[PDB]
Every structure is written in C-alpha cells, then in structure tokens.
C-alpha cells in the first residue's frame, strides 16, 4: 500500500488535490418555491454531489486497497455524514446561514418543515467550526476519517478481519497527519491533544445529524412529494430504516 508510505505533508497534498468541486443548484430567486420544491433543489444537488463523492473516495489514500464490497459498505454508511460535513465547511464563513451552493444561501427560516431541527444542528456545527477556526487541511483529514471510520464496525471470517486492520492503520496515519498540522500551527503538546479531541468529538455530532437526516429522507420517500434520485433511494435503502 502506497497509503501507509505517505508523509504527513504528502497526505495533506493528496487529500487537498482530491477535493470535489462546489456545485450549483437550480435555484432561481425569481421563481416561487414550496417547502417541497425547495427540498427538491437540495435532493437534486445531493444526487449530483454523490457522483463526485464516489470518485473522490477513490482518491483517499487506502480506499482502493479495499474490496469493492467493503468500499460499497463504507460509502453506504458514510455518504450523508460526508455531504453534511462538506456543507458545514462551505457555510463556516456565513454566520447563521447554510451555503448549500454558491447560489443558494439559506437561513433557518426558509428551511420549512423535521428539517428545521437538522438545519439548526448544521448551523451549530458550522458555528463550532468557526469557534475553533477550523483549517482546510484539518477539514480534509476529518472528511477522510468519516469515510473510513463510520462503517468499520458494521461489516464473516478471520481474513475479512484483515480488511479492517488496514483501515485502522490508515486511520492512525490520518491522526498523525492532524497532529503534524497542529504542531506546525505552533500548538503546545497539550493544545494538540485537546484540539485533536475537540475535532473528533464533532464527528459524534455529525453521526447524530446523519441519523436524523436519514430518517427524514425515509419519511420523504414515503410521502412521495419530493423527487428522489435512484442513487439516493439506493443509498437510503442501504440503511434499512
């Protein structure tokens, strides 16, 4: 594996280089939107983002070392957490608003409809990122940690266990990379450990938001007002709500 051979700096470079683009919504400020069609823009965007996410995952060090089956599982478990952390990242410099797309910046108001609590959680996370002054280098590390960690405990044989061993080694490498970055920021050893803890505890909140979002998506399917793509429906189904 070339992944376990990367220096901290090379890891950061690889991750930054692999960042997906920020996509546009079909939002039109002159057109009227219902709670439903508003949700329609967001599900349309998520579907397009998912395609880029899949191709992004292929560039995360270590990911392609895994079996197709294991890759499928990790992405099925992590996809919404990954969309959410990306959204919170984009929104960090827009206090009280979520930048779903450059042409779609919303406050909690428009977020009509369940979705209200989720919007509030996302804003709180963005606020937290802002308090901590989260750096782009730290962000890409966190996103990759989510991809690798979220599905790791929900995977047959003792050989299928080696797959998980490799994931833990890559995760350790990303931890080393985070500490390396903080050491460069001039943080004391005590400050490094504290910040590392602070960053990882946010992942618990992101998991929570994803779980809540997954249940909201399931109710949207049931109501059949908001259009959901085949990919989104398959990703939902994978959670077996």
């Amino acid at each position: 594996s070339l992944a376990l051979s990367l220096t901290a700096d090379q890891m950061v470079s690889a991750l930054l280089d692999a960042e997906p683009p920020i996509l546009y919504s079909e939002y039109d400020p002159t057109r009227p939107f219902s709670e439903a069609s508003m949700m329609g823009l967001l599900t349309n965007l998520a579907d397009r983002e998912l395609v880029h996410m899949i191709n992004w995952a292929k560039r995360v060090p270590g990911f392609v070392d895994l079996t197709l089956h294991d890759q499928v599982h990790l992405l099925e478990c992590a996809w919404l957490e990954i969309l959410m952390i990306g959204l919170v990242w984009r929104s960090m410099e827009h206090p009280g608003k979520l930048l779903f797309a450059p042409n779609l910046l919303l406050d909690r108001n428009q977020g009509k409809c369940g979705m209200v609590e989720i919007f509030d959680m996302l804003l709180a996370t963005s606020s937290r990122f802002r308090m901590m002054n989260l750096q782009g280098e730290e962000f890409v590390c966190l996103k990759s940690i989510i991809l690798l960690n979220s599905g790791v405990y929900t995977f047959s044989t003792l050989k299928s266990l080696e797959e998980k061993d490799h994931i833990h080694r890559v995760l350790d490498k990303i931890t080393d990379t985070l500490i390396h970055l903080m050491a460069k920021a001039g943080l004391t050893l005590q400050q490094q450990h504290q910040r590392l803890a602070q960053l990882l505890l946010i992942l618990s909140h992101i998991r929570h938001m994803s779980n809540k979002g997954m249940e909201h998506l399931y109710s949207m399917k049931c109501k059949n007002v908001v259009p959901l793509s085949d990919l989104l429906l398959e990703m939902l189904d994978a959670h077996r709500l």
Partner: peptide
C-alpha cells in the same frame, strides 16, 4: 446496484 457500478468503473 448504482454505487457498485460507479465504484467499479
């Protein structure tokens, strides 16, 4: 399975 295919190619 869409995800499976997109990952493969």
């Amino acid at each position: 399975k869409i995800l499976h295919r997109l990952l493969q190619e």
